[PDB]
Design a protein around this ligand. Sequence first.
Ligand SMILES: NC(=O)c1ccc(N[C@@H]2CC[C@@H](O)C2)nc1
Ligand SMILES: NC(=O)c1ccc(N[C@@H]2CC[C@@H](O)C2)nc1
Lengths: 237, 237
Amino acid sequence: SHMWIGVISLFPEMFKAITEFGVTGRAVKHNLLKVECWNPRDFTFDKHKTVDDRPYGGGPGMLMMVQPLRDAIHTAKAAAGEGAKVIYLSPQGRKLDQGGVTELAQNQKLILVCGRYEGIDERLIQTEIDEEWSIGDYVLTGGELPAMTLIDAVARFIPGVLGDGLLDCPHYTRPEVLEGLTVPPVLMSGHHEEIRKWRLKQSLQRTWLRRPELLEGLALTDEQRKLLKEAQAEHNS
Amino acid sequence: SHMWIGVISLFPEMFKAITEFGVTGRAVKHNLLKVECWNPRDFTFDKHKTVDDRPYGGGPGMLMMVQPLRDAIHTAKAAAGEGAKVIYLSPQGRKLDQGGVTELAQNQKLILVCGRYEGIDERLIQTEIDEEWSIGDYVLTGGELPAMTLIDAVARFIPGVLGDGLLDCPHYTRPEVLEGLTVPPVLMSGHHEEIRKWRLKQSLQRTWLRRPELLEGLALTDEQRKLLKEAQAEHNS
Ligand SMILES: NC(=O)c1ccc(N[C@@H]2CC[C@@H](O)C2)nc1
Ligand SMILES: NC(=O)c1ccc(N[C@@H]2CC[C@@H](O)C2)nc1
């Protein structure tokens, strides 16, 4: 169940960060993930290969020039064939979370449009973009890091790439004692069921202490209710 | 007011995506931003340069091996001198938003620790990390894209790098008509005050329609209350 992702970007070499390294690098090498980039600069026709343009109404910044960006998008859509969802990365988009990742990962083909300067023409969003997505409520210099973030997150759902609403539990490895801090004995016990429950209780405790709002969205199992109650009682000494 | 950012990563070449391209690339070239990387693999001593290790208690994955990671961190801290805040990137961290970016941007020195595999030993978080930060509620294969995201966001606050709680307004550039869609006449008017108010009204409308929770956190000006009321009346026809 491989995934094809088309990318529109003025800086396609940025995507080497995911295509050449680590788990995602391996996914690309093994043809589980295909990332293909089109650069608006290649679709310019003037001598200086101009990719920006002035905003109507004035303002300090520039926008992506429409014609090169539009042509790049059309070319990516033709390469993708039917069924590709076109996504624009911006702070105005739907905020990404793990549920959203799982939704996006159901697509066999995505096209990711990465804006630079002050963004892109609103009418291109109307005519060319299927969905707007944000990776978080903060502003970046370009849509490339958000696109790579999205790619990395969905790649984890592709079969062969890798080897429940709660924060992760603490993890420990060698040595047994590190600056006076010992590994919790239960993890040394070999008692698989005790270890499972300890890890689950830790996740529940950490979620409650750090991100209590996340618990509101969950229908806890009987076991989770019990372990959370235990953690909260211990916290209250 | 330049910024120095130390990075601990098994894949330092990923950071070329921000140090070699665009606005952040220029910031690095102009010495406004300095990014310096240490690779735990360089601090290994065994023949096969091992950087992972088995989790106590079992489990499917691996963790970062403590000794090479710890030594890399210590080396970065020595290079940084006094006053560097050490940050670990993880989904268990404080969720990044623009207010958090502005807070982080007050630091002259940061050290960013990027985890791989299933993460790092909890005792290293206790002994070496000042703050844990997340870029959003989703899981990635590594902390590098979150680190670069953080770097990009804070870099925007460094003087010379670039040329209020609401979503951005729509932007338009040439041509005047695009697939039948016209530029809003106010933007062609040259009336700077009318354009300002239109843009502000659009931001208020878009925030209300897409992210109404964001408005709850704001103390709107009299002007903003008026324009939002107008937008909501127009929406209700
Ligand atoms: N939070 C995000 O997902 C995000 C996306 C894009 C972005 N910056 C680009 C620059 C110009 C405009 O296209 C938007 N910043 C943040
Ligand atoms: N949302 C985030 O900021 C984020 C940070 C890290 C991450 N993955 C790394 C891999 C191993 C562990 O160190 C964490 N995923 C997501």
